Amino acid sequence: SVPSQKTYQGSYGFRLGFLHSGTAKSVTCTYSPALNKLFCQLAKTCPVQLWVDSTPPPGTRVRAMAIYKQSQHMTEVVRRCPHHERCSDSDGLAPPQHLIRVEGNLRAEYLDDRNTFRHSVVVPCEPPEVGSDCTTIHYNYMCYSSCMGGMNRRPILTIITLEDSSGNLLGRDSFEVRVCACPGRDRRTEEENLRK
Ligand SMILES: CN1CCC(Nc2cccc3c2cc(C#CCNc2ccc(C(C)(C)C#N)nc2)n3CC(F)(F)F)CC1
Ligand SMILES: [Cl-]
Ligand SMILES: [Zn+2]
């Protein structure tokens, strides 16, 4: 079964935000608003901002899940490739098959859905730190988009869901992801492509 990707702000006005990191050759993560697409390097920090108009209840959580963007691939579970699932690089929380990890949160939980076999990672959410206006989650993507036998050059979306403590939907947003060696050049190219 395919989870919904429909944007849904919900009662709390939930939506994502991204830093403005530019497209320099050295950038490790960069987001294209024009493409709604995040470009990032393998296993590097990807900051994703969480925004709401009003604070949801304590016990609200935020889940990330990858799905293939193309129609003929969306029912296939997005997972790490045969090489990376075997490279013994788990931090002790993330199963080695999971593409998306959360960096720097010991309360991250990883789900293998018993019915759909899809992977997700979920963390508690908290109000912003003093002097900040949003919360930030640090994600890591653990395969390249080009990894053969995994994503296999197929585009993916990350679906971010705001959930109550039972897992019921409160909000949903999403963005395309390319995991690549030079995010800055690839963002410029695809943006110049779109422009042409
Ligand atoms: C004008 N107002 C606009 C919205 C601003 N608040 C936010 C702005 C941006 C992000 C925000 C928030 C709030 C949350 C959150 C949560 C859920 N947990 C949680 C835990 C503990 C507690 C307390 C009360 C301390 C306890 N006990 N209350 C909630 N988040 C994260 C989320 F939901 F977006 F992921 C505040 C000002
Ligand atoms: Cl930018
Ligand atoms: Zn891989």
Numbering used by the authors: 96 to 291
Copy text from the publication.
pmcThe tumor suppressor protein p53 is a critical transcription factor that regulates cellular responses to stress. More than 50% of human cancers harbor mutations in the TP53 gene that encodes the p53 protein, and most of these are missense mutations occurring in the DNA binding domain of p53 (amino acids 94–292). The amino acid substitution creates a pocket in the p53 Y220C mutant protein that renders it structurally unstable at physiological temperatures. Rezatapopt (also known as PC14586) is a small molecule reactivator of the p53 Y220C mutant and is being evaluated in clinical trials.
As the lead compounds gained potency, with SC150 values reaching below the 100 nM threshold, X-ray crystallization studies confirmed the binding mode of the lead compounds. The crystal structure of compound 10 complexed with the p53 Y220C mutant protein was successfully determined at 1.70 Å resolution. The p53 Y220C mutant protein used for X-ray crystallization trials consists of the DNA binding domain spanning amino acids 94–312, which was stabilized by four additional mutations (M133L, V203A, N239Y, N268D). The X-ray structure confirmed that compound 10 binds the p53 Y220C mutant protein within a central cavity that is created by the tyrosine-to-cysteine substitution in the p53 Y220C mutant protein, with the indole moiety occupying this space and the trifluoromethyl group extending deeply into the hydrophobic pocket. The 4-aminopiperidine ring extends toward the solvent, and the alkyne linker allows the aromatic ring to reach the adjacent subsite. This enables a favorable CH-π stacking interaction of the aromatic ring with Proline-153. Two key hydrogen bonds between the p53 Y220C mutant protein and compound 10 were observed: one interaction with the carbonyl of Cysteine-220 and another with the side chain of Threonine-150. This interaction helped to orient the ligand in the binding pocket of the p53 Y220C mutant protein and enhance other interactions such as hydrophobic and van der Waals interactions.
